Coordinates of N, CA and C and ligand atoms in Angstrom, one line a residue:
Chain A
X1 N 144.0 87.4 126.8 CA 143.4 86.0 126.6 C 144.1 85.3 125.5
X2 N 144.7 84.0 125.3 CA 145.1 83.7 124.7 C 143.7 83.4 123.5
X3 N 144.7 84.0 122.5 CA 144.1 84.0 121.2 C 144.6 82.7 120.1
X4 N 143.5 82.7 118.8 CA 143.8 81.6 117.9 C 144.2 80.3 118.6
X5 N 143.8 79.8 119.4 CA 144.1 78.5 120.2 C 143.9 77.3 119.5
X6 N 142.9 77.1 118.4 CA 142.7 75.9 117.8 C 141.5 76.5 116.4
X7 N 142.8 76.9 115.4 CA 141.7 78.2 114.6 C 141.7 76.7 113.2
X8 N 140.9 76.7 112.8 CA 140.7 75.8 111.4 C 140.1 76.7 110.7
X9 N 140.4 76.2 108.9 CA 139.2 77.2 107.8 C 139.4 76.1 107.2
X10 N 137.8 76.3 106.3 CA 137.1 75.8 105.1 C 137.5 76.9 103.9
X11 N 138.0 76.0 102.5 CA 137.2 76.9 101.3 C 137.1 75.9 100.7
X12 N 135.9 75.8 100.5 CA 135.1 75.0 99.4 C 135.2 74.7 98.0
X13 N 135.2 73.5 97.3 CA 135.8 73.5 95.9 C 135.0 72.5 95.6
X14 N 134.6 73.0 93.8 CA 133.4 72.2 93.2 C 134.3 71.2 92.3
X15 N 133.8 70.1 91.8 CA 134.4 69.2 91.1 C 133.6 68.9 89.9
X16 N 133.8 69.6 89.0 CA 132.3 69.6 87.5 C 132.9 68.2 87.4
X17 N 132.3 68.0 85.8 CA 132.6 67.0 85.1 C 132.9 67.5 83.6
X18 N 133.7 67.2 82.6 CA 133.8 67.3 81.5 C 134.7 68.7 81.2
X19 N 135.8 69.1 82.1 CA 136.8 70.3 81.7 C 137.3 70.4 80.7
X20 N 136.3 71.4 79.7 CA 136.3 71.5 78.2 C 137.2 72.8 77.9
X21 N 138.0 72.5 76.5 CA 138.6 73.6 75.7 C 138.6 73.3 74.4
Chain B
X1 N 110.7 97.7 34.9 CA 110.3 96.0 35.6 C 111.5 95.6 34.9
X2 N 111.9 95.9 33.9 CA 112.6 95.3 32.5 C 114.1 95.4 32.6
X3 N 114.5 95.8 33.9 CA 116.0 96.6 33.8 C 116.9 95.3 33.7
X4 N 118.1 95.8 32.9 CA 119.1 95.3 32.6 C 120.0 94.9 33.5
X5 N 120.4 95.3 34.8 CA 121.1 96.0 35.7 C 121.1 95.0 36.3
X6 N 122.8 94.6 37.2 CA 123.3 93.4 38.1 C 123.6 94.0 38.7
X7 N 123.8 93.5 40.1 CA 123.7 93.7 41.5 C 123.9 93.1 42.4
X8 N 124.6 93.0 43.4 CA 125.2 91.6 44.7 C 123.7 92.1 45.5
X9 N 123.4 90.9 45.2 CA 122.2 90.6 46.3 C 122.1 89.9 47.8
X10 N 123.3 90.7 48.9 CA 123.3 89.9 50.2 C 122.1 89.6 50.6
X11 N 122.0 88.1 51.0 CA 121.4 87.6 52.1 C 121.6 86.8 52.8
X12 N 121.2 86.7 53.8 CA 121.5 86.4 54.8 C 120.6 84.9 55.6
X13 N 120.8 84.0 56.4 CA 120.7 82.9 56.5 C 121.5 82.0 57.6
X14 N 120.1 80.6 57.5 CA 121.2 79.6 58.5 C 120.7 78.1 57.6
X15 N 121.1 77.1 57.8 CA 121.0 76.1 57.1 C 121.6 74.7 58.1
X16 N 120.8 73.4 57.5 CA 121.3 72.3 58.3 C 122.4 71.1 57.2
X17 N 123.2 71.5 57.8 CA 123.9 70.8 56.6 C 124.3 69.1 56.7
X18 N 124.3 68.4 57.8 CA 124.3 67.0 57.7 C 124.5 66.8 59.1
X19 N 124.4 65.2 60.1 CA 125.1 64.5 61.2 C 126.1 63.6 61.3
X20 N 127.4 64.8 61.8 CA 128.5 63.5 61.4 C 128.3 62.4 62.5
X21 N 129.9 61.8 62.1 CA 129.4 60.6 62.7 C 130.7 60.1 63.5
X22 N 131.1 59.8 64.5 CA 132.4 60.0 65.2 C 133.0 58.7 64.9
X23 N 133.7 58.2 64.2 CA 134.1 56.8 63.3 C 134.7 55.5 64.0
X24 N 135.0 55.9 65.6 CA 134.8 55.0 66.8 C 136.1 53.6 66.7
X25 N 136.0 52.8 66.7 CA 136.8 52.1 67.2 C 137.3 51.1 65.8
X26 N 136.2 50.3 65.6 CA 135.8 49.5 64.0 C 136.3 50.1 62.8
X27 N 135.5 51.1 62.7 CA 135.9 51.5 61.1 C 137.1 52.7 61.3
X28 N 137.8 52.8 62.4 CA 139.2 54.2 62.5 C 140.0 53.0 62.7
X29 N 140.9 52.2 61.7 CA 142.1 51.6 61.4 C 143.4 52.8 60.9
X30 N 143.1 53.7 60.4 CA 144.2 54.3 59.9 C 143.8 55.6 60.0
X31 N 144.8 56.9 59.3 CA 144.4 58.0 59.1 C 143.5 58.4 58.7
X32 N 143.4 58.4 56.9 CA 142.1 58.9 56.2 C 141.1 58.6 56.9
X33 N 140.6 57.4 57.6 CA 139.5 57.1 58.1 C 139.2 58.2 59.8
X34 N 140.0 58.6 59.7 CA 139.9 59.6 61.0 C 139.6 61.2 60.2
X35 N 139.0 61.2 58.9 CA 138.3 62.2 58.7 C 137.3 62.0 58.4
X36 N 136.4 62.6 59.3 CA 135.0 62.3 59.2 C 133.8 62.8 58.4
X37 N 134.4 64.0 57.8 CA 133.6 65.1 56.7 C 134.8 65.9 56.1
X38 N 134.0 65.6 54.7 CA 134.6 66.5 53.7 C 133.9 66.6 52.6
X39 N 133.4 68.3 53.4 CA 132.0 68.6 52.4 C 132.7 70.2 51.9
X40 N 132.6 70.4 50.6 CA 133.0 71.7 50.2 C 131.9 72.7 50.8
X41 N 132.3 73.9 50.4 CA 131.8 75.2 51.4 C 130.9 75.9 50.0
X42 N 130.9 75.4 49.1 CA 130.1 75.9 47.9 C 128.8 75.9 47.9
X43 N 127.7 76.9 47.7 CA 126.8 77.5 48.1 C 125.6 76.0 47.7
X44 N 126.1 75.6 46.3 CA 125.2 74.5 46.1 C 126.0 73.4 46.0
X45 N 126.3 73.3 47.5 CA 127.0 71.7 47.7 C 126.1 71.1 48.7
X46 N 125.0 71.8 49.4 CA 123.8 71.7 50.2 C 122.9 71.2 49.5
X47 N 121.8 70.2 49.4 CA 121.2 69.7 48.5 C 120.1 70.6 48.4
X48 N 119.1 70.2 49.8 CA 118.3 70.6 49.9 C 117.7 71.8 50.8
X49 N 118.9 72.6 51.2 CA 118.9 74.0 52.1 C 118.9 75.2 51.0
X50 N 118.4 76.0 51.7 CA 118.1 77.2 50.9 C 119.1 77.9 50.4
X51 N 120.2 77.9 51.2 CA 121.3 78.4 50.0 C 121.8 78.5 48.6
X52 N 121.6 76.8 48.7 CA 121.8 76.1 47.4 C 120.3 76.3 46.6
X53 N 119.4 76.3 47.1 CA 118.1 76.5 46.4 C 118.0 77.9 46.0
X54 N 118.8 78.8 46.6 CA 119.1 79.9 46.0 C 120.1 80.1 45.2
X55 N 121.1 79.5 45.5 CA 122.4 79.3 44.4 C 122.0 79.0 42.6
X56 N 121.1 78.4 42.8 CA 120.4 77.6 41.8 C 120.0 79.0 40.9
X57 N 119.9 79.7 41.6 CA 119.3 80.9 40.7 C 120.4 82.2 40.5
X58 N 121.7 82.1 40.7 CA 122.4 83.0 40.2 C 123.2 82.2 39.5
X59 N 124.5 83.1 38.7 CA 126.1 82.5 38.0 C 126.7 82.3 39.4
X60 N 127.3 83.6 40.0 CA 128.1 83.5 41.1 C 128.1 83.8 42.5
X61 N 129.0 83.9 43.7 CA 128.8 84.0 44.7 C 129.9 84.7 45.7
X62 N 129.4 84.5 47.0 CA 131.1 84.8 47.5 C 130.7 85.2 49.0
X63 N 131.1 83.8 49.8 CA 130.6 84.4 51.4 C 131.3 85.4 51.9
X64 N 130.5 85.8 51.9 CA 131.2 87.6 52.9 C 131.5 87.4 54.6
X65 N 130.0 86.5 55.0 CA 130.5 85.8 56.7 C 129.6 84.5 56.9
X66 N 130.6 83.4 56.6 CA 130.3 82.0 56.6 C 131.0 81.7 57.9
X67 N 130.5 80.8 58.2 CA 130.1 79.7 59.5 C 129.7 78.7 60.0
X68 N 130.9 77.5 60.0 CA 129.9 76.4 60.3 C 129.8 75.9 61.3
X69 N 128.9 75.4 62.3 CA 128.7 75.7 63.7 C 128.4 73.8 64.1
X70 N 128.6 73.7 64.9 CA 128.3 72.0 65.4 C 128.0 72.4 66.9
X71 N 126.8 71.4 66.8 CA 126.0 71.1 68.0 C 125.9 69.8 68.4
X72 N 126.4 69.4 69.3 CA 126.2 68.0 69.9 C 125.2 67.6 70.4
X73 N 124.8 66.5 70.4 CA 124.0 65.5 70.8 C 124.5 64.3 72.0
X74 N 124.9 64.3 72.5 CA 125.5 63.8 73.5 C 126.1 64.4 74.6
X75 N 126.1 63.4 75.6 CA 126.4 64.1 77.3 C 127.5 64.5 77.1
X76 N 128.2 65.2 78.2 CA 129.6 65.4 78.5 C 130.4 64.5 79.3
X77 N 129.9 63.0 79.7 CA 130.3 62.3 79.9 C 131.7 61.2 79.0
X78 N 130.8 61.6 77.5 CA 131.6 60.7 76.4 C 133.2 61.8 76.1
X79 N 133.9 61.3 75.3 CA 135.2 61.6 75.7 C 135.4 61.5 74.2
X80 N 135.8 62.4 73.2 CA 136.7 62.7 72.2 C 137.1 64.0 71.6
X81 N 138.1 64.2 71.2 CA 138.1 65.5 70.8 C 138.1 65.7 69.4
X82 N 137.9 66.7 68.6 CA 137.6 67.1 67.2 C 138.8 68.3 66.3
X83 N 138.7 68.2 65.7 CA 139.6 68.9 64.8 C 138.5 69.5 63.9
X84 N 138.3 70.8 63.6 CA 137.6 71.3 62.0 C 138.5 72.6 61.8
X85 N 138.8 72.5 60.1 CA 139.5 73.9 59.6 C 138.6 73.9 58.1
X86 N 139.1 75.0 57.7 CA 138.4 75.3 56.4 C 139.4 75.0 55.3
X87 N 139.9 74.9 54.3 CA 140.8 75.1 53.3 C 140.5 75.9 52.1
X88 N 140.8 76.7 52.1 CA 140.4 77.9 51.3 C 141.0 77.4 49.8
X89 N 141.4 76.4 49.7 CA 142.1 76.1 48.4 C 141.9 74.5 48.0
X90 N 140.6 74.4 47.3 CA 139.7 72.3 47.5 C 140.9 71.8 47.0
X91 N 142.0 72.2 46.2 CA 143.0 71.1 45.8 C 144.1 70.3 46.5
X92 N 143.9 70.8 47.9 CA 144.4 70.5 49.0 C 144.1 69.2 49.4
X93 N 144.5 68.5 49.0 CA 143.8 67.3 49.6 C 145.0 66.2 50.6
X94 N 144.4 66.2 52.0 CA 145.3 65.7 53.5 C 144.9 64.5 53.2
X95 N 144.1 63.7 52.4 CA 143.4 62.0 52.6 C 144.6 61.8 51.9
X96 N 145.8 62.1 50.9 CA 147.1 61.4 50.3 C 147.9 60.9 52.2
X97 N 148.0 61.9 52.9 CA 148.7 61.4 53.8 C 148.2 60.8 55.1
X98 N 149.6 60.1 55.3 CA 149.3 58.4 55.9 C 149.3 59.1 57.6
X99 N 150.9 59.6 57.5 CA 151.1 60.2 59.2 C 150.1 61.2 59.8
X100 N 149.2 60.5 60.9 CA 147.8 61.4 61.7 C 148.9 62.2 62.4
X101 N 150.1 62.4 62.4 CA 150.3 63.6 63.2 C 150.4 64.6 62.7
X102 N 151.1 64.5 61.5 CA 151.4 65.5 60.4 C 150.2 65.8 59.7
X103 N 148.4 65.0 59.8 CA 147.4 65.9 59.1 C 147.1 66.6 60.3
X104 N 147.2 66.0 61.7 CA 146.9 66.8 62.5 C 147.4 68.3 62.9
X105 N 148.6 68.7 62.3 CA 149.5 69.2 62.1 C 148.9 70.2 61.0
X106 N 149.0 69.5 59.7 CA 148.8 70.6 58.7 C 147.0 71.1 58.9
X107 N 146.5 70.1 59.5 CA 145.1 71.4 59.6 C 145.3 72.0 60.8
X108 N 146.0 72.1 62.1 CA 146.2 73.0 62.6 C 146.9 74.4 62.4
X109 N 147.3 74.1 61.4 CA 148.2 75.0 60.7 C 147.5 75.8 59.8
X110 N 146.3 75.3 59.4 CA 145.5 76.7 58.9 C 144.9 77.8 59.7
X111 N 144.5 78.8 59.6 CA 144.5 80.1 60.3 C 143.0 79.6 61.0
X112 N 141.9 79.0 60.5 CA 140.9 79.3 60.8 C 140.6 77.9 61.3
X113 N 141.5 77.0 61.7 CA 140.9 76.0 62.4 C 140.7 75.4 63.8
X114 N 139.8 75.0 64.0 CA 139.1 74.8 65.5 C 139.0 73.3 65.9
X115 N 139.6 73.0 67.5 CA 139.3 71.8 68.4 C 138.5 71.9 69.4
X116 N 137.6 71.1 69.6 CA 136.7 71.0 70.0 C 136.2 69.6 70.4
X117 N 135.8 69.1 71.7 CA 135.3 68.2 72.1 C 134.2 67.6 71.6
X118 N 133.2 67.0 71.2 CA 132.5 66.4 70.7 C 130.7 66.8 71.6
X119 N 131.1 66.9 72.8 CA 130.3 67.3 73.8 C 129.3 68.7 73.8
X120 N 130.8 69.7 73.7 CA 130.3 71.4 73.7 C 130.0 71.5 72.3
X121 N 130.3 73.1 71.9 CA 129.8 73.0 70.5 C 130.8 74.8 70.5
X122 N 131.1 74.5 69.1 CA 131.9 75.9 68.9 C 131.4 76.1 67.2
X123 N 132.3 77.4 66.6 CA 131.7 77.7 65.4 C 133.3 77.6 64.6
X124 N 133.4 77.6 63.6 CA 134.4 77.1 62.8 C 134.2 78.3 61.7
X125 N 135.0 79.4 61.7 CA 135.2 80.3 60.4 C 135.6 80.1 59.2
X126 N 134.7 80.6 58.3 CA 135.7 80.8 56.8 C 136.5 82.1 56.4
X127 N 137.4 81.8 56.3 CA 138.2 83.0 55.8 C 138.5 83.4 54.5
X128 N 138.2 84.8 54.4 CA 137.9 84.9 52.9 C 139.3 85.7 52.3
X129 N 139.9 85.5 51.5 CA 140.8 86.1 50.5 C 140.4 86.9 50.2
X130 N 141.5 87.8 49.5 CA 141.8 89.3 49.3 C 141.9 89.9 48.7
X131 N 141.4 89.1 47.0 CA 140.9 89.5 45.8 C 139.5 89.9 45.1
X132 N 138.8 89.9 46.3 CA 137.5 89.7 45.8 C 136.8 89.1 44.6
X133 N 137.8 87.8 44.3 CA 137.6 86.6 43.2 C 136.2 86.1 43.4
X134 N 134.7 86.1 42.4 CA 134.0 85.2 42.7 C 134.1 84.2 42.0
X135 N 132.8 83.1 42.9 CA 132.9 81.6 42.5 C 131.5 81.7 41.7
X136 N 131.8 80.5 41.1 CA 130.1 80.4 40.2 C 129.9 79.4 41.1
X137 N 128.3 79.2 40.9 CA 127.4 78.6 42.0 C 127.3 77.0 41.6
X138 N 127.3 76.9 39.8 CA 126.6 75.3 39.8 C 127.5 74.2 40.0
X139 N 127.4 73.2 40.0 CA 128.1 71.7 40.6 C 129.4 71.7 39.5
X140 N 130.6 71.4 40.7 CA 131.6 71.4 40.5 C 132.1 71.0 38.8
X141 N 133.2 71.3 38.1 CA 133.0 71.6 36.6 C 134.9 70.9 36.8
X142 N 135.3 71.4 35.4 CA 136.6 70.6 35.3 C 137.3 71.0 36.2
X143 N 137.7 72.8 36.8 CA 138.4 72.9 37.8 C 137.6 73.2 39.2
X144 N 137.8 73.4 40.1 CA 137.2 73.4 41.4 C 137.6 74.7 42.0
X145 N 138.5 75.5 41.9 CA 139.1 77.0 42.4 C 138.1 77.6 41.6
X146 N 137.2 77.4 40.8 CA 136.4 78.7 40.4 C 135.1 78.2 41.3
X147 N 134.4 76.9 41.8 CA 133.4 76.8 42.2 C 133.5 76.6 43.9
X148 N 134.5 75.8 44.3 CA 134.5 76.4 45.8 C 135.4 77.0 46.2
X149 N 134.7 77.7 47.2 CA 135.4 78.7 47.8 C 135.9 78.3 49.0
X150 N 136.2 77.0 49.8 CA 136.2 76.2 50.6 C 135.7 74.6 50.9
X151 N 136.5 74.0 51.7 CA 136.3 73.1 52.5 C 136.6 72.2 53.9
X152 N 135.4 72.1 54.0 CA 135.3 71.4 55.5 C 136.0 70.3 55.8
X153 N 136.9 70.3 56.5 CA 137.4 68.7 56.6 C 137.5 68.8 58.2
X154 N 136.8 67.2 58.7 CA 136.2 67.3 60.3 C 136.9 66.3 60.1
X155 N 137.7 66.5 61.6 CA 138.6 64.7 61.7 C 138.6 64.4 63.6
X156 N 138.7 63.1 63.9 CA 138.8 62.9 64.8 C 140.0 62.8 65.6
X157 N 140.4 63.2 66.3 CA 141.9 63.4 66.7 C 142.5 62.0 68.0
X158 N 141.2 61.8 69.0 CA 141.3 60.7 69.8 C 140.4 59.5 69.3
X159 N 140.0 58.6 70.2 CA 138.9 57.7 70.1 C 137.9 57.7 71.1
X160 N 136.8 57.4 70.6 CA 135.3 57.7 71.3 C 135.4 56.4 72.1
X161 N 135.1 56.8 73.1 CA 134.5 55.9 74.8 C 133.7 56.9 75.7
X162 N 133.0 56.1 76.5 CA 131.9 56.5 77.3 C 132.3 56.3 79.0
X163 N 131.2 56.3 79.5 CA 131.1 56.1 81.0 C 132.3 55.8 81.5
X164 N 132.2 54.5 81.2 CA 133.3 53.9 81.6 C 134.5 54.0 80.4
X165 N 135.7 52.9 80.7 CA 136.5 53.0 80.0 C 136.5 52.3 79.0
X166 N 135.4 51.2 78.5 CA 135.9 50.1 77.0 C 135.5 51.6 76.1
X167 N 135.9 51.5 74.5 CA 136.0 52.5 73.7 C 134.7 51.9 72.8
X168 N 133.9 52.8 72.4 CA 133.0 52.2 71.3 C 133.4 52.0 70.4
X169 N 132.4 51.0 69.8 CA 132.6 51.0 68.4 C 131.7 50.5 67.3
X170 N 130.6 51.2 67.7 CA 129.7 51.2 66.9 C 128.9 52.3 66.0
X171 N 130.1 53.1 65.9 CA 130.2 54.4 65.3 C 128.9 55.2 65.3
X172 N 128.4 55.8 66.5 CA 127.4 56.5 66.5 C 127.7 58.0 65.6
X173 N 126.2 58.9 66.2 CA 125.7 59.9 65.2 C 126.4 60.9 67.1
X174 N 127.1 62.0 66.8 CA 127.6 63.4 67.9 C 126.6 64.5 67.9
X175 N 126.6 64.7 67.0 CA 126.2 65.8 66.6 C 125.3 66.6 65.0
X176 N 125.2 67.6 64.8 CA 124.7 68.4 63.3 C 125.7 69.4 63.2
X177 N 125.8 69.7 62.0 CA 126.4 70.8 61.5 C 125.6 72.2 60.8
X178 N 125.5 73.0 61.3 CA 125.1 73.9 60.7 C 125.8 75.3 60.2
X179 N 125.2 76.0 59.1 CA 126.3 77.0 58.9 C 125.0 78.0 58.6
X180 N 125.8 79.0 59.4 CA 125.1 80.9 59.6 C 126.4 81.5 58.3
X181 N 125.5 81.5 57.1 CA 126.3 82.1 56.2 C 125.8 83.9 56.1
X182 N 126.2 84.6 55.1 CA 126.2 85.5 54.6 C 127.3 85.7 53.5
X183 N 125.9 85.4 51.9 CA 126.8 86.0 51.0 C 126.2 86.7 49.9
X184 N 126.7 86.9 48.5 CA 126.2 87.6 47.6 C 126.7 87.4 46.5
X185 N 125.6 87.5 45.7 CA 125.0 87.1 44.3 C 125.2 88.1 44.0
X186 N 125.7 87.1 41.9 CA 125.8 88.5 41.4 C 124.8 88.6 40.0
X187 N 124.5 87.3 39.7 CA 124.4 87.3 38.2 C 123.0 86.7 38.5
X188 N 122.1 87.5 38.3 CA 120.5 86.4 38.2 C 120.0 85.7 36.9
X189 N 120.0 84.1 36.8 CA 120.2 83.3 35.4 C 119.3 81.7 36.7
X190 N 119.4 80.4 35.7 CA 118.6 79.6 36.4 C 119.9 78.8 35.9
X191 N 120.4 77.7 36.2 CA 121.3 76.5 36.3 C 120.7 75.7 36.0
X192 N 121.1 74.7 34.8 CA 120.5 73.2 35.0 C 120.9 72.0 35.8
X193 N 120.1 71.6 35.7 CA 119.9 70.6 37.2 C 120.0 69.0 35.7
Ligands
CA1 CA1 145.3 74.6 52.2
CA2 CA1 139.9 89.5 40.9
CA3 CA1 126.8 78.1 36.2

């Protein structure tokens, strides 16, 4: 059977505030 | 009861030492004015904290692990960053020079100095030399290498703005300064005031 035909991925990503050093 | 006998008396401690003040838009025209504290590290350079209320009661001193720590009072929204180093030697004095790159420079160039945002909060070390030279405790005298053993100098490296982008300038209060010392006394006598 045809495989991966219409494959999508999510990875998720946070966006803080104040990227401190 | 009666003994003759001296002794280093560590103790140990925390103390509130003042609120600086971030010098903002108005009064930061030039260099000098972009340092915002310059408080020596001498036990009784604290008026009314216990250190100095203890200082008050020996000759000499000598932090063994000093610390001065800042805590902010403000969101992480506002925007400046900070400079603090110690100078192990008060005759050092960066307010002669004009170029903010080159003070920014020479206090980075001391071993024990720290940048920090105005927002978080970090601790700022004293580093102690390698003679085990003490300092006497009372208010500074003709020379200053015998009474402090440091100083604080806090400078502002950017300029303070908020939310948005206009820059204040109404020179608010950031933060407190506190310092988690540990040191030791050697000579028990009372100072005049
Ligand atoms: Ca120095
Ligand atoms: Ca010595
Ligand atoms: Ca004295």
């Amino acid at each position: 059977t045809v495989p991966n035909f219409n494959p999508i991925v999510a990875k998720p990503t946070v966006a803080p505030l104040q990227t401190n050093i | 009861a009666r003994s003759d006998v001296n002794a280093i008396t560590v103790l140990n401690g925390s103390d509130f030492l003042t609120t600086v003040k971030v010098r903002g838009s108005n009064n930061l025209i030039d260099s000098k004015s972009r340092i915002l504290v310059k408080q020596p590290i001498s036990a009784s350079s604290f008026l009314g904290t216990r250190i100095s209320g203890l200082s008050q009661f020996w000759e000499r001193y000598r932090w063994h692990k000093a610390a001065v720590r800042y805590v902010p009072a403000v969101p992480n929204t506002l925007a400046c960053q900070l400079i603090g180093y110690i100078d192990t030697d008060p005759l050092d004095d960066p307010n002669v020079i004009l170029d903010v790159d080159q003070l920014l420079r020479q206090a980075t160039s001391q071993v024990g100095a720290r940048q920090w945002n105005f927002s978080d909060t970090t601790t700022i070390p004293l580093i102690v030399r390698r003679d085990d030279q003490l300092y006497y405790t009372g208010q500074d005298k003709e020379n200053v290498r015998f009474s402090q053993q440091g100083v604080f100098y806090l400078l502002q490296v950017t300029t303070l703005l908020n939310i948005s982008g206009e820059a204040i300038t109404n020179d608010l209060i950031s933060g407190s300064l506190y310092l988690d010392w540990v040191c030791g006394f050697s000579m028990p006598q009372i100072n005049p005031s």
